[PDB]
């Protein structure tokens, strides 16, 4: 997901502006749905929501627009159990042996013959929660097991939280409402208001451990691999309690990252750290936010956002619709010169030609160079010390950069990587005259619609994830509900689309209508005022009661 | 009663629901959503109820790409009656009303559906929903940043035998 909030100091109109570009599945239980909700006099909000949830998840109201992105904070901890040496169904806390609880669930299963069988399954639970097994990493043997404590299992506030957000007036009110309830499970919140405030909040439900306990309570090897793992044999490693927190064992709001500015804030799924590089967010618990290298989507956004120039609505729109493969900026110049050094190489010719002709984009009309680039990058990612300029914490916006071609081994390995990528591409048997839009599609009935965009890991702001199905790449997730909100005098102006359309049902008139538009990248008014709604020639009305 | 909503649709089938209270508001949302997505919600409720193997057998998967039986075990565990009741008990009157109205609005569409925008008419898993079903969906989503990511791992956790 991407989010950009722009304030009074940077917007062309001196007022707030928000780009919401959440990246979600195109099917299933997290498929967004557009709706506008009004209880006249006290609720008037529009945006998108998730299946079965009667509140707006991402949206806007008269003076406010907000969105969310998945954060990097932990929302659970694993606990390594020290098992009772005499009994692997018992575990030690402060040297005292405790029994696991056994909870059986019963499931009905439909067999080939069409009849139901009952299956019973035992779920083992510790004081922390259920045991979990990852064979070869988190085993359950005679020495240890792992239990999982999920912080959101006790979060009964989640629905109230979004209902409250839906009632928020401006950025200050939104901040108050979220900090007061702490009901947001696992996302950042970014927002802008008419007065030109831009807000970033890493305000979610995060396990709390006081600073002094982290060194002793962490499992070092597992934490080093990105898992929030704690010592479950020591009662002192229970989540800490702080009366200010809305829920026992979670981090109080004052200790979670917030940035309130009048220029901009952004997030593309990295930590709070470089939300705005002018004001870095630092000194938080590692369970909350770490100073880790930013992904290429964020690096891309910051490269377009840094500076003094006014930001227009058009600018933010074009950051999505340009489909620029930003990762090419760091590697493609040096790759092309390797290509020019190896023109006598038969196995490289087609790749090098396709890469040289490529527009560095993931547009419908982008050439096969994008495919060659993707397969090369999957191999480049595996090489050691291949960056000319490796990540520099002092230069977090401009590194890593370039290929270390002057180093003999790197040159060999990068050439081999390109040779192997080219082999993979040409083995797939697709023609060279084929463009990206000929490959990446969304099926609608028996028909297919070409879809622009590409994987977020290659720095395409318009992130689209796809998989091989038949002869094409079938879109499964990415750019979903798009909303770009400004605040001119008459009321909020919202512009966007729901990429996959309102209805998942092939029979609906709204199964593919916005998907055709998404393909052509033609965003539309999201009508919010009675005037805008009334102006729509497609307007239909039904009143219902029982 | 209390169940009354006014719905306007603009281009692309975007609904604009107006009501005097949360119960009416939910009524409109559930009805509008069902018109577009009855089959989707019905399927995902089967998943959140842990009844995929019952309707579809052990060979299939959920839309999250989990095997039906492990998915069912996980949701049966997550959405036990005691857990749903505690969750419901903690909800404000406003949220309870939104959910109540939502379930009624969805069910109203189901009573009237003739297949015009519903491809799964006649399937046994397409049925009237309850507020508990909405709670099941909410909790499913709630744990997506936590234990839901370890669904397979939870199902796989069994104590060792007599091995070396």
UniProtKB/Swiss-Prot annotation, chain B:
What is the superkingdom listed in this entry's lineage? Bacteria
Disulfide linkage: none
Q: What is this protein called?
A: Acyl-homoserine lactone acylase PvdQ subunit alpha
Q: Which organism is it from?
A: Pseudomonas aeruginosa (strain ATCC 15692 / DSM 22644 / CIP 104116 / JCM 14847 / LMG 12228 / 1C / PRS 101 / PAO1)
| Encoding gene per record | pvdQ
Whole-protein coverage range = 29 to 192 of 762
């Amino acid at each position: 997901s991407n989010a950009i909030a722009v304030g009074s100091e940077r917007s062309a109109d001196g007022k707030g502006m928000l780009l919401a570009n959440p990246h979600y599945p195109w099917n299933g239980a997290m498929r967004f749905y557009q709706m506008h909700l009004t209880i006249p006099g006290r609720l008037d909000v529009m945006g998108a929501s998730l299946p079965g949830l009667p509140v707006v998840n991402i949206g806007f109201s008269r003076h406010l627009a907000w969105t969310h992105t998945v954060d990097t904070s932990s929302h659970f901890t694993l606990y390594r159990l020290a098992l009772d040496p005499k009994d692997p169904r018992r575990y030690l806390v402060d040297g005292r042996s405790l029994p696991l609880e056994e909870k059986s669930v019963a499931i009905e299963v439909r067999g080939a013959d069409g009849k139901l069988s009952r299956v019973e399954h035992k779920v083992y639970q510790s004081i922390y929660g259920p045991l979990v097994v990852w064979p070869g990493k988190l085993d359950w043997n005679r020495s240890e097991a792992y239990a999982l404590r999920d912080a959101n299992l006790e979060n009964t506030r989640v629905l109230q939280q979004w209902y409250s957000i839906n009632q928020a007036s401006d950025v200050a009110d939104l901040r108050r409402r979220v900090e007061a309830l702490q009901g947001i499970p696992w996302v950042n919140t970014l927002a802008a208001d008419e007065q030109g405030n831009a807000l970033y909040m890493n305000q979610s439900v995060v396990p709390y451990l006081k600073p002094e306990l982290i060194p002793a309570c962490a499992i070092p090897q597992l934490v080093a691999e990105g898992l929030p793992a704690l010592q479950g044999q020591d009662s002192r490693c229970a989540w800490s309690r702080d009366p200010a927190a809305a829920q026992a064992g979670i981090t109080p709001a004052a200790q979670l990252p917030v940035l309130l500015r009048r220029d901009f804030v952004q997030n593309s799924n990295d930590s709070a750290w470089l939300t705005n590089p002018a004001s870095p967010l630092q000194g938080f618990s590692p369970l909350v936010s770490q100073e880790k290298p930013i992904g290429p989507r964020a690096r891309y956004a910051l490269s377009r956002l840094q500076g003094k120039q006014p930001l227009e609505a058009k600018t933010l729109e074009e950051m999505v619709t340009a489909n620029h493969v930003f990762s090419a900026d760091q590697v493609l110049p040096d790759l092309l010169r390797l290509c020019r050094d190896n023109q006598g190489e038969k196995s490289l010719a087609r790749a090098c030609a396709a890469l040289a002709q490529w527009d560095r984009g993931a547009n419908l009309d982008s050439g096969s160079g994008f495919v060659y680039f993707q397969r090369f990058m999957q191999r480049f990612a595996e090489l050691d010390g291949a960056w000319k300029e490796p990540f520099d914490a002092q230069r977090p916006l401009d590194t890593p950069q370039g290929i270390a071609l002057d180093r003999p081994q790197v040159a060999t390995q990068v050439r081999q990587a390109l040779a192997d990528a080219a082999a993979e591409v040409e083995k797939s048997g697709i023609p060279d005259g084929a463009r990206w839009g000929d490959l990446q599609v969304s099926t609608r009935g028996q028909e297919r619609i070409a879809i622009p965009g590409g994987d977020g890991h290659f720095g395409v702001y318009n992130a689209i994830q796809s998989v091989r199905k038949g002869d094409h790449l079938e879109v499964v997730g990415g750019t979903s509900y798009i909303q770009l909100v400004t605040f001119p005098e008459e009321g909020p102006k919202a512009r966007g689309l729901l990429a996959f359309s309102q209805s998942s049902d092939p029979r609906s008139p709204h199964y593919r209508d916005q998907t055709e538009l998404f393909s052509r990248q033609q965003w539309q008014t999201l009508p919010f005022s009675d005037r805008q709604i009334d102006a729509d020639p497609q307007l239909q009305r039904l009143s219902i009661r029982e | 009663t209390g169940l009354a909503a006014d719905i306007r649709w603009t281009a692309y089938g975007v609904p604009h629901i107006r009501a005097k209270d949360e119960r009416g508001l939910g009524y409109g949302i559930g009805y509008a959503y069902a018109r577009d997505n009855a089959c989707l919600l019905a399927e995902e409720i089967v998943t959140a109820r842990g009844e995929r193997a019952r309707y579809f057998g052990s060979e299939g998967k959920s839309s999250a790409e989990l095997d039906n039986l492990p998915s069912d075990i996980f949701y049966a565990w997550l959405n036990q009656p005691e857990a749903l009741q505690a969750f419901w008990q903690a909800q404000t009157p406003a949220v309870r009303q939104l959910l109540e109205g939502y379930a009624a609005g969805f069910n109203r569409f189901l009573r009237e559906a003739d297949g015009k925008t519903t491809s799964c008419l006649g399937q046994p898993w397409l049925r009237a929903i309850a507020t508990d079903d909405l709670l099941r969906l909410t909790r499913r989503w709630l744990v997506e940043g936590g234990v839901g990511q370890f669904a397979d791992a939870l199902v796989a956790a069994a104590p060792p035998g007599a091995e070396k």
